[PDB]
């Protein structure tokens, strides 16, 4: 009705928060663990590597200042769990802002 896969997570064993935060036992990383977990991410245990349990997108090399939700959208706009969670205008927001930054830097050729 809204697809096969999209409808179905890439890793159901990580659909519940509780399941995800656990993976963050030893989080020696700047980014907050509760937040990542909330944004759908979990830790692979290969450093600061994380993967959204639904679209299966993976992020790494997090900066201290970064927001889980923003980079999830900055990189994986298509995730359905993201759309249910943060809505349409949010996703497009992040992307427009980037698109604007690009065009404003294009004046520099």
């Amino acid at each position: 009705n809204f697809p096969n896969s999209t409808n179905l997570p890439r890793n159901p064993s990580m659909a519940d928060y509780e399941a995800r935060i656990f993976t963050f036992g030893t989080w020696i990383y700047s980014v907050n663990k509760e937040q990542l977990a909330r944004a759908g991410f979990y830790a692979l245990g290969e450093g600061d590597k994380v993967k959204c349990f639904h679209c299966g997108g993976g992020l790494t090399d997090w900066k201290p200042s970064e927001d889980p939700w923003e980079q999830h959208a900055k990189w994986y706009p298509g995730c359905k769990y993201l759309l249910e969670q943060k809505g349409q205008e949010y996703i497009n927001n992040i992307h427009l802002t980037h698109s604007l930054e690009e065009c404003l830097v294009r004046t520099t050729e």
């Binding site: 590597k49 997108g57 993976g58 992020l59 790494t60 090399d61 980079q71 990189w75 994986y76």
Partner: peptide
């Protein structure tokens, strides 16, 4: 962040 960076994707992988």
């Amino acid at each position: 962040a960076v994707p992988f």
